[PDB]
Amino acid sequence: MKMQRTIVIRRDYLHYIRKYNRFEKRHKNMSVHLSPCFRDVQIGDIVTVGECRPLSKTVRFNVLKVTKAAGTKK
Partner RNA sequence: AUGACUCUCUUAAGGUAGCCAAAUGCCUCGUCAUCUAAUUAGUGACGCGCAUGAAUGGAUGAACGAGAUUCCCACUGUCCCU
Partner RNA sequence: AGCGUAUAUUAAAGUUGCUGCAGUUAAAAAGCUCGUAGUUGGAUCUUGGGAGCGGCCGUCCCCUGCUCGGCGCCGGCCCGAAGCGUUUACUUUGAAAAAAUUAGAGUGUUCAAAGCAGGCCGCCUGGAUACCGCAGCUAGGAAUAAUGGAAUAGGACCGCGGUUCUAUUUUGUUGGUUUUCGGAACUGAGGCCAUGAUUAAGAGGGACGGCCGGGGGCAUUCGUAUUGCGCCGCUAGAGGUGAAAUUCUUGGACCGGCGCAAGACGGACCAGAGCGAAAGCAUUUGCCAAGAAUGUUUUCAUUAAUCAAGAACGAAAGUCGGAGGUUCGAAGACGAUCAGAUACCGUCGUAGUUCCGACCAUAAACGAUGCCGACCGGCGAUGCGGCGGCGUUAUUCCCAUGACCCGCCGGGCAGCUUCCGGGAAACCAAAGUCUUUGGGUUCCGGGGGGAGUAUGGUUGCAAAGCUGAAACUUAAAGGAAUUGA
Partner RNA sequence: AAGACGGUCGAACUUGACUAUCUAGAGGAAGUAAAAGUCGUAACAAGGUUUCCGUAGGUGAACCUGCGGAAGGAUCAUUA
Q: Which residues would be at the binding site for another protein (CB under 8 A)?
A: 14, 17, 20-25, 71
Binds 70: which of another protein, RNA, none (CB < 5-8 Å by kind):
RNA
Q: Which residues would be at the binding site for RNA (CB under 7 A)?
A: 13, 15-16, 18-21, 24-25, 70-71, 73-74
Helices (H) and strands (E) in the chain, counts: 0, 6
Chain centroid to CA 38: 15
- What radius of gyration do the chain's Cα atoms show? 15
Least separation in angstroms between residue 40's CB and RNA is 12
Residue 35 CA to residue 56 CA, distance in Å, equals: 15
Least separation in angstroms between residue 22's CB and RNA is 8
Residue 17 CA to residue 1 CA, distance in Å, equals: 34
Least separation in angstroms between residue 5's CB and RNA is 27
